[PDB]
Symmetry: C5
Subunit: 103 residues, 5 copies
């Protein structure tokens, strides 16, 4: 088990770390069918998604996908600094795998 | 997958974008049977619903419909500026498909 | 579909609207068996419940009854003005069907 | 159905009201097996638990037990004044049945 | 039943109490498959995990694992002082069993 997001990120293929050190600029959420997902942006336009649950996900990720969306919404509303995101870069928007926040 | 609420909204029939750039003026919620829903309004009078779950919804939307009502409650209480809504315009009130929030 | 709490409330037998325009004075909730409920009061004396779930309720209302208790707790803690309540008046305390909040 | 926490407390055996009129001093929660529970204390030393769900509880209490842990956490973090607790006094620490909160 | 975290912690094999008396320095959470977890650090460099749900865990712990992650996230965002952690020391990072918070 990893001790930090950078290390956890590197346990997967098709990942990269984005270092933001900034609050979220915009939070978007959708309940439209086949687009049950969230999208966030930062002030420079970099855009990220929490993917729609799909075949690529294993069952244990389902709860976690819901929690991440909970996280992003509260982070946005509290203007919390996001340190890093670990993302899969084989999707557009890059798909969030993990988030770190630090003051 | 879309990168933003406008493009997402364009993936569906019977939808349009409202551009509000304003906080929620009122939040209403009901537990009355066949009316388990939320309704919001803006100061310009525009009124939107989170629809009662119905036969038009697919199963993957049920959790996202609960999430949206969570989101609208917290956005209301935090006076968060709603940027745009993507809504179905074949329902009265217009039915929320997606929301975007930015400063 | 109604557009506001007053019209929604009138879709049911045994309901009325109370107009508070005040924050919640006290919040009470219970885990005791057969009294899994919430009770709120206002400074004017008015007291309301969220009913214990029972067979008077259809299944779709179960989640909304939970949500309503969430809403009342957070509105209490945030000192949010409650505008109106739709209640059933064939219970004592009057049973909450819907709430509206506005500045 | 009762109108207040004292009357509700009186519908059960082995209970009493404690009047705190104070915020919670400490919040403790555990995920260890067989000790899935919450413990709070007040500055006067008084200590209370939300019991581990057990065979004494009826199905309808399960969700209310989770909700009470939620309520205690948020009451702690927001330094909400706890007015009264209804507890069962045949457990040690005394076990929370109900809570009231007021300015 | 125990009345505080130290005594609770002592009812299990392979645990220890860490005393932090400090806010959380960073919160990380992951939805990557097999790494559905949270990791927190403090400014003293100490690092702790909420374990991925696993076969070691009994059924009653699953809800409490989710609750813990909720607790850590909101502790972080409110800059709540963490008093103590009870951890299992047979995992790297040490795995959270229980948390106490006090001003
Ligand atoms: C910590 C750990 O177990 N890491 C392993 C992961 C992991 O088991 C799977 O990602 C969990 O589903 O599986 C890795 C990986 O890099 O993802 N893996 C996966 C596979 C074949 C199946 C596969 O690619 N699953 C990942 C799909 C990806 O799912 C992602 C979401 O979880 C994203 O949607 C991404 O865009 C998609 O490519 N072969 N190796 C190997 C890596 O060592
Ligand atoms: C991104 C994507 O998958 N978009 C597609 C959507 C989508 O698959 C469905 O809406 C998901 O249920 O289905 C589309 C759509 O526009 O909704 N679709 C669906 C259909 C036939 C069935 C249909 O109209 N289902 C949606 C009914 C609408 O449900 C909405 C709620 O989700 C609202 O209640 C709206 O008022 C109602 O008309 N014809 N086209 C085509 C579009 O390309
Ligand atoms: C918008 C809508 O569908 N409104 C209709 C409602 C509604 O279908 C049911 O209340 C939902 O269960 O059912 C109405 C109603 O007024 O409640 N209805 C239902 C009935 C027969 C059964 C009945 O009275 N169910 C409601 C019981 C009430 O449940 C309420 C909780 O939901 C309260 O506990 C109230 O104290 C209790 O009397 N007769 N009229 C007719 C109304 O037009
Ligand atoms: C409003 C209401 O229905 N009140 C009744 C309650 C109630 O039905 C049960 O407590 C719900 O499970 O059941 C009462 C009660 O006082 O608890 N009751 C129940 C019984 C036999 C079974 C019994 O004692 N159940 C309660 C056990 C208590 O559970 C509590 C958790 O809910 C605590 O853990 C407590 O320490 C324990 O003694 N005898 N009286 C009588 C009371 O009038
Ligand atoms: C209050 C109480 O019931 N305490 C008892 C606990 C408890 O029943 C179990 O931990 C609940 O799963 O079980 C104890 C314990 O110390 O864990 N126990 C359990 C066992 C054999 C099975 C066992 O080791 N289960 C715990 C494994 C641990 O699970 C933990 C998560 O819950 C951690 O992942 C930890 O790293 C791992 O070693 N031997 N003693 C004895 C202790 O008296
Ligand atoms: Ca700070
Ligand atoms: Ca204001
Ligand atoms: Ca205000």
């Amino acid at each position: 088990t990893p001790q930090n997001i950078t290390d956890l990120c590197a346990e997967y293929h098709n990942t990269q770390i984005h270092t933001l050190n900034d609050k979220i600029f915009s939070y978007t959420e959708s309940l439209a069918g086949k687009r049950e997902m969230a999208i966030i942006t930062f002030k420079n336009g970099a855009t990220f998604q929490v993917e729609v649950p799909g075949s690529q996900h294993i069952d244990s990720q389902k709860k976690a996908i819901e929690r991440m969306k909970d996280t992003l919404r509260i982070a946005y509303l509290t203007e919390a600094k996001v340190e890093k995101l670990c993302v899969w870069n084989n999707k557009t928007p890059h798909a969030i795998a993990a988030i770190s926040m630090a003051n």
